[PDB]
Amino acid sequence: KRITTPYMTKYERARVLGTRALQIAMCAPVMVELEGETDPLLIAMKELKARKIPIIIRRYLPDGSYEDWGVDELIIS
Amino acid sequence: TVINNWLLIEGHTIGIGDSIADSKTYQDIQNTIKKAKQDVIEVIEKAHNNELEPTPGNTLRQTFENQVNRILNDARDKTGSSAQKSLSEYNNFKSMVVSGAKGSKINISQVIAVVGQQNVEGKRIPFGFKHRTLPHFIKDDYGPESRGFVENSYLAGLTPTEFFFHAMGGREGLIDTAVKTAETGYIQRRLIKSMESVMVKYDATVRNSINQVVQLRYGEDGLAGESVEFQNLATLKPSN
Amino acid sequence: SLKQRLKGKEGRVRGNLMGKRVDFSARTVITPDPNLSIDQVGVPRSIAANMTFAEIVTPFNIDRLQELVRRGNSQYPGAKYIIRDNGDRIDLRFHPKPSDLHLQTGYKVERHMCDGDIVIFNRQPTLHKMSMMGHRVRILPWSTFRLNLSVTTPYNADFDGDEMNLHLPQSLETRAEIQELAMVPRMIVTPQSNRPVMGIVQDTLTAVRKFTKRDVFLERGEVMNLLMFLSTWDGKVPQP
Amino acid sequence: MNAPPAFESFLLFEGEKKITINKDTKVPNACLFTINKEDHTLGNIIKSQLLKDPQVLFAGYKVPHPLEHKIIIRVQTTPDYSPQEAFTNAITDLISELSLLEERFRVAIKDKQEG
Amino acid sequence: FIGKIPIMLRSTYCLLNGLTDRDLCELNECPLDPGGYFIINGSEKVLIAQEKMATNTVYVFAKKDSKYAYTGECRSCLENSSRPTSTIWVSMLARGGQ
Amino acid sequence: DGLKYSLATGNWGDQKKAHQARAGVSQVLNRLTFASTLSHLRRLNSPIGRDGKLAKPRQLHNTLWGMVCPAETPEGHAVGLVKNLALMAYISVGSQPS
Amino acid sequence: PYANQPTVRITELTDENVKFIIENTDLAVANSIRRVFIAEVPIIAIDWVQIDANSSVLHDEFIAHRLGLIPLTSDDIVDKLQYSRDCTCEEFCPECSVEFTLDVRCNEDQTRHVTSRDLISNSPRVIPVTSDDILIVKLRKGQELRLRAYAKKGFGKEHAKWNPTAGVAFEYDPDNALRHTVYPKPEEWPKSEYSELDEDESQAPYDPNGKPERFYYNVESCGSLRPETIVLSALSGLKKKLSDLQTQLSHEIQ
Amino acid sequence: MIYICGECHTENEIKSRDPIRCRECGYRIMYKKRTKRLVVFDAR
Amino acid sequence: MIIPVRCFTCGKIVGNKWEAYLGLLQAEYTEGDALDALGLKRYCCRRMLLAHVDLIEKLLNYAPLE
Amino acid sequence: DEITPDLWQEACWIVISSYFDEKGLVRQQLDSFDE
Amino acid sequence: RKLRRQMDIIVSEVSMIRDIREREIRIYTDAGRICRPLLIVEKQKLLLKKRHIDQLKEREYNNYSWQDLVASGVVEYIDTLEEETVMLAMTPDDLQEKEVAYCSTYTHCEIHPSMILGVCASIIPFPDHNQSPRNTYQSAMGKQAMGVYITNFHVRMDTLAHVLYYPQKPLVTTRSMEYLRFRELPAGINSIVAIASYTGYNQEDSVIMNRSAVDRGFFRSVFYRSYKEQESKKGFDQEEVFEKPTRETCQGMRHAIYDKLDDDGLIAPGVRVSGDDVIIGKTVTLPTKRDCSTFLRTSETGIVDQVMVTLNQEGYKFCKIRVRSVRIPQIGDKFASRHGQKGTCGIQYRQEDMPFTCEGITPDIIINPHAIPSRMTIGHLIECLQGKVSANKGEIGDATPFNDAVNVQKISNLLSDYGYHLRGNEVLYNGFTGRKITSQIFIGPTYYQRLKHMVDDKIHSRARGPIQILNRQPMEGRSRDGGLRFGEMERDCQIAHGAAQFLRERLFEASDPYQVHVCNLCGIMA
RNA sequence: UUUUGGCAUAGUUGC
Ligand SMILES: [Mg+2]
Ligand SMILES: [Zn+2]
Ligand SMILES: [Zn+2]
Ligand SMILES: [Zn+2]
Ligand SMILES: [Zn+2]
């Protein structure tokens, strides 16, 4: 019963990468096989390409309802 | 990087030789100016003898002003065209104009041939003195140089009256720049403060802060302005 | 009066809520630099040594941030502060205490801004999206903001004395936001008129007009020199 | 204020290598020589001498930034002749040329003074 | 005594009046200095010449920020005395309003 | 003090009624280069007033031939309101008509 | 695959300039030689001005800057001198610097001219080249200038005071045979002094097989070095640079 | 504590407590004497 | 202020020619003839002696503060 | 008798030099203050 | 008019205007009227004769001056009101000579049209060949130019002063400059400038400069700043005393050093000072004591040039300390021709790197070619050509505006005599490779002015520091420091970006974060 | 042993 677009908006990509990079900077577990990657932003981008980011986007429709999309569920542009 | 490094081998300049036309071109420009002045005198003589008739919708002053204005405009653009034809391929003004990097063809014509009519509030130079633009003219003189048509190019240098009228012309440029800067932001801040809260909601409708439908889809199509582009409908114009 | 305190351009709601002075901002004169990518901005060493960014200590960067803490403020690149987990702040230009220089995961080091940092770059008046854009910091040894020439026309800037402002995002989430939304390569096409906002400009535009003429011929050494500056070159010299 | 010292355009600071070699993976038998604290003085002359070699398929140089002091010289060679060998041979050729030029300039000075 | 008047430099009452360039150098005053300014608390102050409409002269204008077709202003002022200038207008009422 | 204050601050009129006083008449002399000093000493200021709103004064008028400089005026919100005298222009000092 | 055999011909040799022609050379070597004339020939110039008393009208940095620009006779001493940064001393010993002393008191009423004649060296081989003399500053009655300064070995790349050349004229292809420059109207251009065309031609006929060669030089010395010494030291310095680069390259390859 | 009178150029040792005035001309502008520290400029 | 030591463009010594230049001008030389007599052929060098304004002579009118 | 056009260029600037020798550039301020 | 021209009962400044059409004779005598001298014309002849010119040639040792010219009834002052009743000749040489008649009744004749210009516009060479907005821009920039502002600058102590090391009178000059004393106090240097595209740092109205020239003092300048301060006595509320604050006796100080000062609390002249060092040690008594000593500005640095001590109007001791700072041209400093060609120094190249002619001349400055065409500052090019002719000929060129004895053809013919291309172009060689540049570069001397706006006086940055006392936000004080206003324009620009996190970070986190406690039931801050 | 600050005006100037 999802009516929103299946594509990650640029704003969704921005906020997801920001929050996940902050989490990685706080010693969060990393859900991708990194190799000498130190910058949290690059690790977050690698996770996003691997679709391994464990975040759910809650998109609020303009009637108080909402839809919860897994990051893996959405089409990465 | 590549073009800037090749330009060290090529190199590009601008000099006096790029603003110089051959003697034949100067003679042609002077003949054009003499013809324009002579026919302006003809129009003045027709007006003084009540032979000039007003056009429909315009008074006699407006008719005379339109005639002399179109005369001087065609003279100016003819002189500019002739100067443009005189340009060599090595001429750096032409190189910078055809590339679109800087300047315009009007700038070349002004530098080489004729700076042209100087205008204040969209009219020729007004009679500040008693029926005169300056103390150096006679009263009721509507000739080109009297009312502020400068005929020398920037290369040739302007005469005192021509220089003063050109300063008068540029003063409006400075002032309207100032008032544009005065109105910078004001229209923009009024527009944004009216519209800043309008957003594309997740149902793809366009709504404001109070969540009222402004457009059912953004731009009436739901498409962003970034990735749209001009095309031609192939079936509109062709006949049956 | 209280009514005067809130009304007007310099009121509390229009002078201190909609706009206000901000920390971590620098300003200086801009100068050209064709050797920088369009997403790069030259930064003076003093501005970089004065402005800081909070880097969270991780086991990956523990050694690097420990070295920066050892350097301190006197030496660039270094750090200003250590913010421990408790929130207490250790200054590095006054404290030689080695116990205070211990770092552990969760600590934040306000390191000096270094190369590759993302910065929002702005020219007032701000008239559209491209008047504030994200750039990558490049430390160069002089007292001006060096810019690529192509990014002048979105900012509507010229190096006749223009100053420009540089804001440093202080958080990873804001840094990622500027990376993914406001970087100038993403701002190439404006949605105002669905076209590029920046193109090729004065010298390189004139020079590429002259370069792509039919009769431009380059010998072997010249092309071998030019291909050095081509970053995307695959390394194969084309057949002449 | 931010003006760099005048000496740091020809002086190597501590732990800076004068010249560094890196193979170019895009093309076989191609190398990049990054020489620090040099300028067009050595770049152009070494490029010209390398172009005189018949076995050098490509020889070019660039200063990455004028405010910085580096020259990156890309040298690609035929498969039977290394770029390092070509670089060394080019420098030896230039040294021999300048030594010969010193000798002949001294002879010319002596002739003009005697004359 | 009634007060102290500031003195424009190099005027007829400044001490540098009619002094040769040598004496100006002895007083450490630049002979090329044009003067024409006052020294107030050590700061060099210059009075900018203020433009204003001429007085005692009839000027007929045509206002349309009002109900008059025309208006003859005359900023009459006394000669050398009584600086407050009395401005009289004589207007013709507009015939459009009726 | 009364002159001094008015020359120190450039507020002209009654000191206590400085709310409605004309400001900026007296300015600190601009000593950056000799040309700037001379230009500042030969300067005319045209206030806005009620009359400036009737007819636009910013534009260069024909009568300004030979009296003020045709091309010299600060940019921004001062174009045409601040002028400089022509070289040989001289302002009448006044005399008695008797 | 090897070096050219360059040939020299000296056309003119005065005590202030040398004019010569190099044939059988590529353009890059000639240009680098000119570049090394300008910016890589070491000379001795004043640095480290310590002012004890300066009551002149010119401030202290002005006097120090003027002293730095005075050329000093460094014909034969500069080669055996060392850069001060490399020497092992207090930065001023006789093996890396030459002391200078100026002490001028203007007592007479007449204007006293502080010239380069008033610079006393502690080494006779190094003096101001004019010793009319270069005016440093004019003093009034009661004014005094008194200072001491040294003179270090440096080259023009670091600062222009160490540039020995007063303008290095350099030319090649005087008739434009190679068409490295394209005159829009070749008739309008004056013939170079090395041109070989008659007074009916404007350019030599175009040569497709041509290559730059026969480079004409005119190296004018400011005075600190003889012009022949400038050229010889230039070639020696460029050879030294290339040999050092070969040493570092051999170390890197090893 | 030596100053130099602006007019007659007299060296006057003036304490920090007393008013400043030339002890042989009465002039009231005094300039400090040049420092005896060590001052050095590179001649660049 | 005072004659520069070097020519700004080419670096030729010019500071040792101001007094000689003025002396030649007192000998009724055209300025071109004076510069030619002093041996300044490049117009870069000639510009400096031709356009120099000697203000130090004017600055020496003021008595020193000693 | 009268100034010929070839000599007029010298004559007019002689007149202007005399004007500025007599008056100077700040006659406005000084004359107003003296009055 | 007879009485006025004879300096009879009517004085010169009295103006008589006859409105013939309205039958009025208005005589004006009051002050405030503007006028100018015009030569009187009678029967199409100047009343000025060769005898007057001969008398004026011996203006010295004859006591014949301008006032005798006015008294002779040859020149009279005409005001702008009387100009309406005047038929004026532009130049006597042609405008009143017999020909096909335009006007046979001339009442006056201009002395020289160039006198319409002011002071700052009269230093423009060839202003009648420029676009008028650039004449205006130069009329401002000449006000802003560095130079020797006065010959007694040594004794003066002004708050800001800029003095150029080696100013030069222009090689191309106007006649009117003779009377502005510009020849005695010039503001600028003649610069060998080549109008050429090059490595790319001159683009977009910027400038490449010759580093070796700057090393030779080219446009080197000195910047004097003077700090004043006074010790006061306000009853017995407190008392300020000049003395070096000791670390023990005053409980308020800063981390800056206090040993630079002498025993009298003043720094001696000839001592280097950074942007935080103390120069006037002043201690205010505490009803121990506190300090209110003054420091240099945060960005500034220099050597104490001069320190004067004297008594103010109240008899209180007070001193003024001049601080010398030597400014060398660098990247960012503004330069301008006398034609509105404003531009900053893009980069500095050594002499070997600059391009050079066949005779070893490297330009001091390179400007972009594209600064000319939209500008149409052809006067700049004519100045460069005339300056080249002047420097070769050894004669200060003339650039009076409305002069027909000089034009570009005559200048080019003169230049061709000296073995140069008649249009000023030259064959320049690439300084890097030594190759001839394909196109021939326009090069020659031109007068340039260093404007006072240096980069070091306009560079500042902030991380955190002196917030406001009321708004708790950054503020300006003690320097340019205090952050930049993130105005409404920037706010909406970031709203258009959709950068909500960065907008919040700018406006809340990194300007004035705060947190309060509010009751849940009511809404007032508890 | 770790500070720091006048507020509101008016003028001038840069883009
Ligand atoms: Mg600008
Ligand atoms: Zn030693
Ligand atoms: Zn005394
Ligand atoms: Zn020279
Ligand atoms: Zn509550």
PDB file of N, CA and C in Angstrom, chain E residues 19-31, chain G residues 140, chain I residues 61-63:
ATOM      1  N   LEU E  19      52.919  84.003   3.863  1.00  0.00           N
ATOM      2  CA  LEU E  19      54.255  83.563   4.236  1.00  0.00           C
ATOM      3  C   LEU E  19      54.907  82.848   3.063  1.00  0.00           C
ATOM      4  N   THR E  20      56.186  83.133   2.850  1.00  0.00           N
ATOM      5  CA  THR E  20      56.939  82.463   1.804  1.00  0.00           C
ATOM      6  C   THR E  20      57.097  80.980   2.130  1.00  0.00           C
ATOM      7  N   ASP E  21      57.480  80.210   1.108  1.00  0.00           N
ATOM      8  CA  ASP E  21      57.591  78.763   1.265  1.00  0.00           C
ATOM      9  C   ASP E  21      58.666  78.386   2.276  1.00  0.00           C
ATOM     10  N   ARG E  22      59.728  79.191   2.378  1.00  0.00           N
ATOM     11  CA  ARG E  22      60.769  78.928   3.366  1.00  0.00           C
ATOM     12  C   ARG E  22      60.201  78.965   4.778  1.00  0.00           C
ATOM     13  N   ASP E  23      59.451  80.022   5.104  1.00  0.00           N
ATOM     14  CA  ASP E  23      58.887  80.145   6.445  1.00  0.00           C
ATOM     15  C   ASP E  23      57.880  79.037   6.724  1.00  0.00           C
ATOM     16  N   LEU E  24      57.104  78.645   5.711  1.00  0.00           N
ATOM     17  CA  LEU E  24      56.199  77.512   5.872  1.00  0.00           C
ATOM     18  C   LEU E  24      56.972  76.240   6.191  1.00  0.00           C
ATOM     19  N   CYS E  25      58.137  76.060   5.568  1.00  0.00           N
ATOM     20  CA  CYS E  25      58.974  74.914   5.909  1.00  0.00           C
ATOM     21  C   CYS E  25      59.529  75.032   7.325  1.00  0.00           C
ATOM     22  N   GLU E  26      59.862  76.250   7.765  1.00  0.00           N
ATOM     23  CA  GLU E  26      60.369  76.423   9.125  1.00  0.00           C
ATOM     24  C   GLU E  26      59.307  76.090  10.163  1.00  0.00           C
ATOM     25  N   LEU E  27      58.039  76.365   9.864  1.00  0.00           N
ATOM     26  CA  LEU E  27      56.930  75.968  10.719  1.00  0.00           C
ATOM     27  C   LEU E  27      56.458  74.545  10.447  1.00  0.00           C
ATOM     28  N   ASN E  28      57.186  73.781   9.624  1.00  0.00           N
ATOM     29  CA  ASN E  28      56.820  72.408   9.276  1.00  0.00           C
ATOM     30  C   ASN E  28      55.426  72.344   8.656  1.00  0.00           C
ATOM     31  N   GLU E  29      55.132  73.306   7.784  1.00  0.00           N
ATOM     32  CA  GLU E  29      53.896  73.358   7.014  1.00  0.00           C
ATOM     33  C   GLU E  29      54.238  73.196   5.542  1.00  0.00           C
ATOM     34  N   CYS E  30      53.513  72.322   4.867  1.00  0.00           N
ATOM     35  CA  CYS E  30      53.795  72.037   3.469  1.00  0.00           C
ATOM     36  C   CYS E  30      53.447  73.250   2.610  1.00  0.00           C
ATOM     37  N   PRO E  31      54.377  73.815   1.820  1.00  0.00           N
ATOM     38  CA  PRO E  31      53.996  74.966   0.982  1.00  0.00           C
ATOM     39  C   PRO E  31      52.976  74.634  -0.091  1.00  0.00           C
TER      40      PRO E  31
ATOM     41  N   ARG G 140      70.576  66.151   5.683  1.00  0.00           N
ATOM     42  CA  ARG G 140      70.563  67.550   6.079  1.00  0.00           C
ATOM     43  C   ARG G 140      71.583  67.778   7.188  1.00  0.00           C
TER      44      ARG G 140
ATOM     45  N   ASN I  61      63.920  70.349   3.268  1.00  0.00           N
ATOM     46  CA  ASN I  61      63.685  71.710   3.738  1.00  0.00           C
ATOM     47  C   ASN I  61      63.312  71.737   5.212  1.00  0.00           C
ATOM     48  N   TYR I  62      62.669  70.684   5.707  1.00  0.00           N
ATOM     49  CA  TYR I  62      62.239  70.638   7.095  1.00  0.00           C
ATOM     50  C   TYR I  62      63.414  70.300   7.996  1.00  0.00           C
ATOM     51  N   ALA I  63      63.525  71.027   9.101  1.00  0.00           N
ATOM     52  CA  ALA I  63      64.601  70.766  10.044  1.00  0.00           C
ATOM     53  C   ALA I  63      64.420  69.386  10.676  1.00  0.00           C
TER      54      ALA I  63
END
